[PDB]
Each structure stands twice: as C-alpha cells, then as structure tokens.
C-alpha cells in the first residue's frame, strides 16, 4: 500500500539551494513517472524513465534533472530554487497492466531566508468538569503554536499506542497574524474519551507534534536554537477529581 | 532463410522512338533487404537514377522500384543489373519493349 | 470501395556492436504517405505523399515521438529476441512489423492486423477476433505471455476499432482525388513464335489504379491455370499499376483462346483476342 | 484534454451525486479514477476501457461514455471525504503517462442524530493561566465563523468519531492571549442554536 | 496514425 517509497517526506530550504528528491519503485515495476501538483493547480507530467533510460519528457524546467540508476531506483533534482518549485513531487510505477501506483510525496517548502522557521509550542488542555457531569465524555485539546511552515503531523497517543478513534485535527493550520505574510500558524486536536476512561490515573494521553525544520544541509546563526526536525509533546495523567 | 531478387526492367509507357519515358526497374521478392542495382545503357551504368522508399510485403519479402527520364531507340540496348547475398554473380535482364 | 491502412515496421541489427535501425513506413491501400528512419542526427517523421502535407505540427510530433521511443524499445526487443535462439551480437538479425485495419464497400472495420516476423519468418500474429495470438515456437510464446500480462491484444483491439478506422476514413477524404479514384486498365495482346509451329499469347493491362486485377486466358471457354506465366503487378511510376499474362499455345490452323480482364475501372469485364 | 466538474462538492451524509470527467484524446487507452486523502498521495479505484464499461465498488460506481466518466457515489458518508481525480492514458502516446484533471474536492457534512450543543472551558494540563474554549455536540446546520479581532482565535468545526459507541461529534476551539476572554462570548460572531448549554 | 506502444511491449 501502494509499494512505491519515496524520500524526504518533507523539505524546507531557501532559494537559490538545491535538493534532491528519491524514489524506489514497486517490487517488479521497471518505470519511474515523476509528478508535480503545485497548490490549486493539479498532477503534472514531468519524466519517465524505463530500466534506467529516459523514455518520455513532460514539461519539467531545464534547471530540474533526474535519472533512474541501474537497481532501478530514481532520483530528481530540482535547482536553483525559486518560490513557485514550492509543490508536492509525486513519482508513479507502472505495472505490466497499465496501472500507475503513486508514492505518498515530497512536500518542499522554499522560502528566501530560514530566519522565519520556527517550531511548535504544544499544550494539552484538560477536560471541563462541566461536560463530564453534562456528557460523560471527556475531551482533550492540543494546542501547538507559533510553527512555521505548516510542515506539522499531529497524533494521538494514549497509553504508548497512536489512536485514531474519538480524534479530529483541524484539516488547514491558522495563521496567528493573517495580514503577515510569513505568518506563524497554530493547529488544533480533540481526542474525545468515556468519562470514566478519563477518571482512571493509570491513564496517560499524549499529543505529538512532529515538526520539519532544518536538516543540516542549511547554516544558522541567530541566538535562539537551530529550528530543526523535532518532535514536540505535552502531556497529561488521568483524573478522579 | 535468404529469397533471391524476382526482377523486371520496363518502360512507365509503351516504347515509342524519340519520345521520353522512364525505364524502370522492379526488384522483388528478396530477402534481406540489403541489395545493389543499377540501370545501364549499352552495358555502361546510368548516374542519376532514383529509387522508391524500400518497403515489404505480406511474405516478408523486401521490393523496391528504380528508375531514371530517358528516349528509347532502336540501336541503344538498356539493361539492369541486380546484387544481393543469394547472387553468385550480379544478375543482368535487358530491357525488352516488344515483350 | 475496399480500403486499407497499414503501418510497416523493420528492426536491424547492426553487426555488431551498433545502434540498430529502425524505419516506419505508412500506406493508405498502395500509396505510401509516411516514413520515419531512425539513422540521422535528428530523426523527423517525412510526408511521402502530397495529401498528408496538410496535417500540423502536433499531428508530426505525435508520430515522430511514437518513432523515437520504437526506436528504443525495438533494440531491447532484438536483444530479447538473441537471447531466445542463442545468436551471437556479430551477425545482422531484422524484427519486421505490420498492423492496420481494413474497411469493405462500407466504410465500416471489416478485419484488424497485427502481425510480426522476426529474421523474415512468421513469429507471433494477432488473430481475427483480435483478443488472441498465435504464437510460432517456444521462443514466440515467451513474447505471448509478456503481452498476455501487458494487455497488448486489448489496446491493439481499441486501436483498430477507434483512431485507425478514424485516421483512414480522414486520409480517404483529404485523398479522395487519388485515393477514392479508379482507374480502368488499356488492354491489347502480343503474339510471339517460341520454336517451330509453336507460339506464345501474352495480354496487356496498363495504367491500371488500384492494383487489384485478374487476367486469364480461356481456351475454347476453359480457364488454363496451370501453362500460364501470371507475372507479378508492378508500378508505372505515375502512381498506376501494370501486369501481363501468357500462354503457350499452337498454331493449330484456329484461333481458341481469349484474354479475360476484371477491374473496378471497368463498367463491364474485357475478352480481347489476338488480330493480326 | 481533461476536466473535472464540479471543483467542490458539498454533500449532506446519504445525499447522492455524481462527479464528472471530461476528456479529449486522440484515441483512449484507459480511463482512470483515483482518490486522495489530504497528505497522502493518489490511491487507484476503477480503470475504464470502452464506452458502457462499469465498474463497481462497495459505494462507488464508475461508467464510461466516448466523451465523459462518471464517478457516482451512493449515500455518501463522511469517511468518503477527499479529492478525486480522473486521469486518462491516450492510444497515440507512447508509454503509460497519465494526464490528470485538477480534480473534485468533496466533503461530506455528517448527520448529528442527538445534538447537545455547549460551550465549556478547558484549563491547561502543565498549570499555567492558558485557557481554551471548545464548542461541542451542535447539529450539522451549524457553521462556526471567525472573529475580526486578531487577538482571538477561532478553528473550523471539526467531526470525531467514536467508532466504538456509534456517535459522531462537530467541535470547534477559540483562545485568546487577552486575559478577559471568557466562553459566553467566544462563539460571539457565530450564530449558536437558542438551545446552548452554558456551564456556571 | 500509427498506435503508441504502452510500457513492457517489448518482444
């Protein structure tokens, strides 16, 4: 599901840099197609590859290359960054049928200068006593804030295990100031539990925020720490009273 | 494996003295396509003689057609003159208008 | 009338270590209209008759791009082709393609093709009911199960009921002048004495268009198929067809045999007799 | 060569419709539909081949004609919320590149079968003066808008499912810097249902 | 119009 693996998952640098994108394909697939989906617009054609040789070119930029090595894995790069490269790069594998299987994608973020990347604060806010006595459900909130740029995966964690059920995450984060152009955002989450789940102390709930930041192909030189790829937590215990 | 050249030399209209024609050149049949022909007057090759685009048919076998402008007499001999693989000797058949 | 497109395709090894040639020819019953030659620094696809000229440039680049990557795909076939009869890379070994549709009076899809040879011998064909193939040996059933896997049979299948029939029906129209014209064949007869009291019937047919023809030679009102020399249909060079045919007959004191001509120029068919 | 009609579809759980593609080849391969989730990348679905052809799965139906693709979705739920996208392979192509519509983003506004529409207060776990605001339990009539002040902040309404007790349940969250903020006047921009329960 | 050969049409 689907088979195609592709790598970084995510990758923030500034303009004028150069980054390199990596794509394996499905087990017994010899093709690579190499997508782009900029924001509004859709899924464009960029190249293919056939057993490590091109074999059909769409409209990718001739500061952008890619090659398919000979194990069959494939590898784009995209230069002189500008702004508008900031897109999803997908990359597909046909099967003998016909089919394409896409990669999950690359999200790159270019922005002109790194100063303005930051990572999340978290907070985990306890349930009202109000809406226990009124529902006997519990509900949590996350809160993390002050990131940029919105490259933030939210979860759940109760008891060691990630939870998917009695959760929802705000689908778009919130610009903190919506007239500033390199706004900072802020995300949300409920968890919702049973009231008695929540009433046990020998229940812990966690909520991650892993953040993209900086990966070391970049230089920092300003007095607050580095604003690299993290994880960031808060937590809280179970409560009787 | 190898199919050795069906050939045919004729004129594009009926041999009329002092009017001009094409003498043609119809090789057919062979197989590979690699061949050598050539148009000659009185036994002395033709220079500027051209060829249809090599193509093949249904048996596989490979045809094509050469040609060249002239005026036929009744002293001049014209000929044909066929090289290909399966050939031990290059293959000559005259041009004869009252076939 | 009965009308075709074919696309004929050859695959040559260099031997033996070159890059091989891959050349497309395009006909439209017996006109060709198109040929792309892999060998050249910028390999384009050309018009070869004067009714295609009209098509543009994304019509010749969608053509020249299916060449370019035939070009590619063609070699690795050559290569898998070497492979299945043990050959060595020194000596010349040739793939050979063709394909197309054929329309009857009815410009309807009469019957698809999709046939391939490999060294000029049958390989691999597509069958009537276009969904199956016929495979020669052991070798062109290793291609079967690939193509049986790539759902090749299908796509060939939509190929010939979709734009092959479309692009043909287009072709006849900007060619009708040419194309959809038929034109009827000049007859006469040539008598020649081959030895002593012996002598030779031989029958005209010239400046005929389609090339679809029969000549036969009766005696006494029974076709003699076997004596005859049925010579193959040639080209003039002006787009019109020639053939001949004739027969060894005897002088015997009377004059039995006649000439019988058939053609789609004709109104009615021709009997022609040799007069002195 | 390929359009996606409508851009959005805004659907009301169990209410029916379809998706359209519309396409231009010289000859069609393959039609294709694929679905994609927010983050992840497209999932395949149906392959349409000739003019007539359905396909069918569970609450999907795809058919086919000679100028468009319907992609038909049966009571939708709101688990079928994502985008969809057409694609399309052509006969005078070579390869097996797709060229894709922009795609159809639909959303399917959940039922709420017993609404408890509230306001409640949430302190922060790790003591601090932090305080959020959640508004919970409201019908799917009610729409959460956001504040003209910059000092507030107000989230879209958001559904959770609690798959084990068969509910489903909107939310939206408000906080403030401002120490005066309070939860009576959080959801203050927004039209509430008469009936809000707010906790003393 | 010749046919575009799709992926693994190979011999």
Request: overall charge negative; aromatic content about 12%.
């Amino acid at each position: 599901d689907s088979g195609v693996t592709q790598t970084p998952k995510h990758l923030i640098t500034a303009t004028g840099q150069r980054v390199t994108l990596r794509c394996s394909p499905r087990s017994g697939d010899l093709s690579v197609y190499w997508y782009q989906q900029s924001l509004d617009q859709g899924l464009q054609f960029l190249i293919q590859y056939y057993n490590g040789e091109e074999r059909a070119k769409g409209n990718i930029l001739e500061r952008f290359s890619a090659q398919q090595f000979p194990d069959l894995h494939s590898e784009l790069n995209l230069s002189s960054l500008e702004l508008g490269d900031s897109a999803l790069y997908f990359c597909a594998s046909s099967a003998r049928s016909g089919e394409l299987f896409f990669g999950e994608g690359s999200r790159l973020t270019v922005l002109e200068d790194l100063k303005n990347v930051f990572p999340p604060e978290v907070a985990v806010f306890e349930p009202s006593e109000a809406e226990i006595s009124h529902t006997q459900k519990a509900t949590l909130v996350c809160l993390a804030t002050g990131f940029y740029p919105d490259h933030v995966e939210l979860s759940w964690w109760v008891n060691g295990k990630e939870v998917h059920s009695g959760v929802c995450t705000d689908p778009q984060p919130l610009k903190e100031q919506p007239a500033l152009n390199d706004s900072r955002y802020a995300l949300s989450s409920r968890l919702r539990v049973s009231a008695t789940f929540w009433q046990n102390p020998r229940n812990h709930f966690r909520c991650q925020v892993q953040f993209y930041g900086l990966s070391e192909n970049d230089e920092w030189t300003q007095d607050r720490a580095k604003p690299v790829t993290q994880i960031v937590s808060a937590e809280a215990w179970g409560r009787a009273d | 494996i190898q199919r050795t050249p069906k050939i045919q030399v004729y004129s594009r209209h009926p041999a009329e003295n002092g009017k001009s024609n094409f003498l043609n050149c119809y090789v057919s049949g062979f197989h590979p396509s690699d061949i050598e022909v050539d148009l000659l007057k009185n036994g002395e090759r033709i220079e500027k003689v051209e060829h249809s685009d090599l193509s093949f048919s249904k048996d596989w076998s490979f045809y094509l057609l050469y040609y060249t402008e002239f005026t036929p007499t009744e002293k001049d001999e014209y000929a044909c003159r066929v090289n290909h693989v399966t050939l031990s000797q290059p293959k000559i058949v005259k041009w004869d208008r009252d076939m | 009338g009965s009308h075709s497109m074919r696309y004929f395709y050859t695959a040559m090894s260099r031997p033996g270590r070159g890059e091989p040639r891959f050349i497309a020819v395009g006909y439209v019953d017996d006109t060709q209209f198109v040929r792309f030659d892999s060998d050249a620094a910028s390999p384009r696809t050309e018009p070869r008759a004067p009714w295609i000229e009209q098509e543009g440039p994304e019509y010749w680049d969608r053509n020249t791009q299916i060449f370019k990557t035939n070009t590619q795909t063609y070699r690795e076939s050559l290569r898998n082709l070497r492979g299945y009869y043990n050959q060595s890379e020194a000596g010349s070994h040739i793939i050979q393609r063709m394909y197309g549709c054929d329309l009857g009076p009815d410009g309807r899809l009469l019957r698809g093709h999709d046939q391939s040879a490999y060294d000029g011998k049958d390989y691999i064909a597509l069958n009537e009911d276009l969904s199956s193939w016929t495979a020669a040996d052991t070798a062109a059933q290793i291609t079967q199960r690939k193509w049986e896997a790539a759902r090749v049979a299908e796509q060939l299948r939509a190929y010939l009921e979709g734009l092959c029939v479309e692009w043909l029906r287009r072709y006849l129209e900007n060619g009708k002048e040419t194309l959809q014209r038929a034109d009827p064949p000049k007859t006469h007869v040539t008598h020649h004495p081959v030895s002593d009291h012996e002598a030779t019937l031989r029958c005209w047919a010239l400046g005929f268009y389609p090339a679809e023809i029969t000549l036969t030679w009766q005696r006494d009102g029974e076709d003699q198929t076997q004596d005859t020399e049925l010579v193959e249909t040639r080209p003039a060079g002006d787009r019109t067809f020639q053939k001949w045919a004739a027969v060894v007959v005897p002088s015997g004191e009377e004059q039995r045999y006649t000439c019988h001509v058939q053609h789609e120029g004709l109104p009615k068919p021709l009997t022609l007799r040799w007069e002195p | 060569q390929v359009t996606q009609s409508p851009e959005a579809l805004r659907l009301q759980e169990g209410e029916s419709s379809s998706l359209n593609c519309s396409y231009t080849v010289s000859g069609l391969r393959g039609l294709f539909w694929y679905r994609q989730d927010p983050g992840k990348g497209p999932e395949f679905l149906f392959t349409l081949y000739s003019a007539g052809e359905e396909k069918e799965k569970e609450r999907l139906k795809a058919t086919l004609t000679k100028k468009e693709s319907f992609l038909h979705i049966t009571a939708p739920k709101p688990e079928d919320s994502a985008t969809y996208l057409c694609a399309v392979q052509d006969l005078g192509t070579s390869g097996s590149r797709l060229t894709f519509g922009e795609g159809t983003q639909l959303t399917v506004n959940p039922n709420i079968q017993n609404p408890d529409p509230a306001v409640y207060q949430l302190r922060d776990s790790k003591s601090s003066d932090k305080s959020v605001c959640l508004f919970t339990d409201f019908d799917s009539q009610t729409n959460v808008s956001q504040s003209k002040d910059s000092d507030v902040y107000i989230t879209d309404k958001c559904v959770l499912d609690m798959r084990s007790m068969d509910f489903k349940s909107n939310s939206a969250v408000a906080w403030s810097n401002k120490s005066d903020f309070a939860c009576a006047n959080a959801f203050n921009n927004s039209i509430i249902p008469e009936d809000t329960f707010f906790p003393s | 119009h010749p046919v575009g050969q799709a992926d693994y049409f190979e011999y």
